[PDB]
Paper text:
Residues 297–391 (using the numbering of the longest human brain tau isoform) constitute the proteolytically stable core of paired helical filaments (PHFs) from the brains of individuals with Alzheimer’s disease. At the end of both assembly reactions, most intermediate amyloids disappear and filaments with the same ordered cores as those from human brains remain.
The first reaction was carried out in the presence of magnesium chloride for forming PHFs, whereas the second contained sodium chloride for forming CTE filaments. From 180 min, we observed multiple types of filament in the PHF reactions. As is the case of the Alzheimer fold, these protofilaments formed a turn of a β-helix at residues 337–356. In the different filament types, the J-shaped protofilaments packed against each other in different ways. Among J-shaped and C-shaped protofilaments, the opposing β-strands comprising residues 305–320 and 365–380 hardly changed their conformation, confining all differences to the β-helix turn and its surrounding residues. We observed two main types of J-shaped protofilament, as well as several other minority types of J-shaped protofilament.
Numbering used by the authors:
A (entry chain C), B (entry chain A), C (entry chain D), D (entry chain F), E (entry chain B), F (entry chain E): 307 to 378
Amino acid sequence: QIVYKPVDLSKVTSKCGSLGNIHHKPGGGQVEVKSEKLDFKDRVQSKIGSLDNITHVPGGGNKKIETHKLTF
Amino acid sequence: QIVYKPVDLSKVTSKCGSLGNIHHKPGGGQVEVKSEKLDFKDRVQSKIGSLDNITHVPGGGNKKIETHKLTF
Amino acid sequence: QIVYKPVDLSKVTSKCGSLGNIHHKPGGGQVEVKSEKLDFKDRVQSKIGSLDNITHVPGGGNKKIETHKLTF
Amino acid sequence: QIVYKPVDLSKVTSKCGSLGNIHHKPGGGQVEVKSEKLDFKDRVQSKIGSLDNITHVPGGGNKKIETHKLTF
Amino acid sequence: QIVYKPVDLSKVTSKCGSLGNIHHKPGGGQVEVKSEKLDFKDRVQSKIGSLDNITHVPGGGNKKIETHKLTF
Amino acid sequence: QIVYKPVDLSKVTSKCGSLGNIHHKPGGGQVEVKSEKLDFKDRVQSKIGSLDNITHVPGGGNKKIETHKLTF
């Protein structure tokens, strides 16, 4: 008699990219008089209090190769 | 007699990209008099208090290859 | 008699990328009179109080190769 | 001429009670053979690996009393 | 001439009770053979791996009293 | 001419109770054979690997009393 009962009970997780929490609070203080004068003239690039979150995940893949043979 | 009963009970999860929470609160402070003057003339790029979230996931795939043979 | 009963009870986790929490609070202080004059003229790149979070994950993949053979 | 323009720009916050994070991981280790025999017979009180979080806040109230008078 | 124009721009917040995160993961470890035998007979109280969160907030109230008079 | 323009730009915060993070990891080690025999007979009180977090906040209140009078 032969019994062939291999059991895959496994658990696999991938968690990839921007996982953590971001808190961005620019200008959260106290001021009496606030004045901003912006003069931008030629080919200017500007970020003021902005948030860019850029995420690339080519990875994070799960791969199982499993071979079962019984030869009698 | 032969019994061939391999069992795949496994669990596989992929979680890929922007997973975390974003909190963006620009300008949330206290001000009495606030003034802004913006003068932008030629090929200016500006972000003020804006949020960009860019997510690319070519990955995060799950792949199973499983071969079963019994030869008697 | 033969019994062939290997059990994969394994647990595998990948956690890859920006895992930690970010707190960015520029300008959170106390001031009476605040004035800003910005004059940007020619091919200027500028960041003021802005947040860039850039995450690349080509890794963080999980791979299982498992071969089972019983030859009688 | 009289101008009566007192300005309340104030910000008030109360944050009272269980503010912090609790992480409770009883039994998170590695064991080959684990056995537990519990025999509790008369007026026994028992906690095993349980979490009680009890919060009472009679406080944390915010109170403003403000009186404005102009007598001419 | 008289102008009576007091301004309340104020912000008031109460946040009272169980504010923080609870993570309770009893039994998250690794065991080969696990056995538990429980025999409880008379007026026994038991908690095993359970979570109680009890919150009482008689407080956390906001109260504003504001009086305005102009007498001419 | 008279101008009466006191400005309240104040910021007030109360943060009261259990503020800090708790990490409780009982039994996180390595053992081959673990056995526990508990026999509790008469009016026993027992805590094993349990977490009690008890918070009382009758305080943490914010109070403003402000009086403005102009007599002409």
